[PDB]
Amino acid sequence: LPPGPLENSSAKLVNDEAHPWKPLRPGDIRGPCPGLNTLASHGYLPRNGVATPAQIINAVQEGFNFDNQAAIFATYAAHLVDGNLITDLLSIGRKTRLTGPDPPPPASVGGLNEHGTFEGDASMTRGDAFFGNNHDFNETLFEQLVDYSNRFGGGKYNLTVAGELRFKRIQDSIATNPNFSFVDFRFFTAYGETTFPANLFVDGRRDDGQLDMDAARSFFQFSRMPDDFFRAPSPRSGTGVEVVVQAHPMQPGRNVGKINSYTVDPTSSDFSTPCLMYEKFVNITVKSLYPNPTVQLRKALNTNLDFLFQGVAAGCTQVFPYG
Ligand code: HEM
Ligand SMILES: *[C@@H]1O[C@H](CO)[C@@H](O)[C@H](O)[C@H]1NC(C)=O
Ligand SMILES: *[C@@H]1O[C@H](CO)[C@@H](O)[C@H](O)[C@H]1NC(C)=O
Ligand SMILES: *[C@@H]1O[C@H](CO)[C@@H](O)[C@H](O)[C@H]1NC(C)=O
Ligand SMILES: [Mg+2]
Numbered sequence: 001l002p003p004g005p006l007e008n009s010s011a012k013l014v015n016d017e018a019h020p021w022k023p024l025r026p027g028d029i030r031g032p033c034p035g036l037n038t039l040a041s042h043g044y045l046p047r048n049g050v051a052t053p054a055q056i057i058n059a060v061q062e063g064f065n066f067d068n069q070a071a072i073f074a075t076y077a078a079h080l081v082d083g084n085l086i087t088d089l090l091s092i093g094r095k096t097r098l099t100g101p102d103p104p105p106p107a108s109v110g111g112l113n114e115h116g117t118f119e120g121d122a123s124m125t126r127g128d129a130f131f132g133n134n135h136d137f138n139e140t141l142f143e144q145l146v147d148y149s150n151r152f153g154g155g156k157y158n159l160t161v162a163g164e165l166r167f168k169r170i171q172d173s174i175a176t177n178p179n180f181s182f183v184d185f186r187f188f189t190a191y192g193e194t195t196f197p198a199n200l201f202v203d204g205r206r207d208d209g210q211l212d213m214d215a216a217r218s219f220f221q222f223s224r225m226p227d228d229f230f231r232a233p234s235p236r237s238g239t240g241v242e243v244v245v246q247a248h249p250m251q252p253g254r255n256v257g258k259i260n261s262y263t264v265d266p267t268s269s270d271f272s273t274p275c276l277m278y279e280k281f282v283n284i285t286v287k288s289l290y291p292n293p294t295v296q297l298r299k300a301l302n303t304n305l306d307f308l309f310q311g312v313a314a315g316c317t318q319v320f321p322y323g
Helices: 034-040 051-062 068-082 141-150 159-176 184-193 196-200 213-222 241-247 274-289 295-311
Strands: none
Touching: 034 051, 034 213, 051 068, 068 274, 068 295, 141 159, 141 213, 159 184, 159 196, 159 241, 184 241, 184 274, 196 213, 274 295
16 A cells, blocks of 8 residues: 655654665666665665665655655656556666566556656756666756756755756757657656755755755765755655746647757646646556556556555546546
């Protein structure tokens, strides 16, 4: 079952003796999410980068104080499109045999590195998949985050910096990635993720939304908590996303096979239709990976879809693609 919220959500030392940072061993998997990467590299998750949904939810709550609803939605969304529903295992990065025997095509079980399922374009510190690598830390892009932090954050990353950098990344992808896609689930996650460094990488004794560049580099590049790192003092995820959107409001869309051809998709959900984002994720994304599942895969799908729905905000109607 999905874990429930923390019994004690106060700030505390999370870079503690039981969770030391260690470097990667051969075969250890890290991916496009610096949160999950850091949790693996401190042993909140298995250090090889392969984990169950329940392990992921427990780790994001205990290590960073990610809120329960957000943890459940993100984890089950990722597992449904990128994980192995029979073995209950998800890679936090590249596709691996460690998640078990694969289901039939068209399901990919490609881990979090799979482009266009959860991962997508205009990431802050990772390049678009079209440019060859959607998962490793990118120094040029991080130096641009440092530059935007120096320009709009007084040297720190905050929500003002997030608003400017989010737009700059979208504009850069429009100008250079002929396959740029910015609709539905990615449209939502691309905005929320820009608040996470300000809300979750800032030491919880301060919780001031001002992330220093030493801490930023430690998390984004080395999957490493600063020495003496205290997690946030309460559960949260995307608080302040409205500031990022307000800086440069965008409509969902995509380049249409050429640079500078950004075309709005009226069938995409946006922030006016959050329930549509969930319904399309299940009815289109999940169903297309598993269009005619066998009995045991259907059961695992329905269970994980029920868990996903627990992370949906109230007032949406649950949808049942397999009955
Ligand atoms: C709850 C389970 C979570 C899952 C399944 C998840 C998964 C992902 C994935 C697949 C991406 C890549 C999206 C992209 O940029 O293309 C991503 C990005 C990101 N995640 Fe997570 N994540 C989770 C929780 C967290 C937590 C707890 C943090 C912070 C402590 C975090 C911070 C980030 C950040 C900052 C990015 C954007 C990286 C960038 O744009 O350079 N995530 N996540
Ligand atoms: C990192 O991003 C820059 C800027 O988009 C790109 O030119 C470069 O090829 C990427 N990869 C690296 C530095 O490995
Ligand atoms: C970011 O920092 C700059 C400089 O200190 C400040 O002007 C701006 O208000 C800050 N924004 C937030 C949301 O803290
Ligand atoms: C999803 O499918 C359900 C039927 O299972 C239907 O009621 C709903 O309107 C569909 N939503 C979308 C956005 O396709
Ligand atoms: Mg990406």
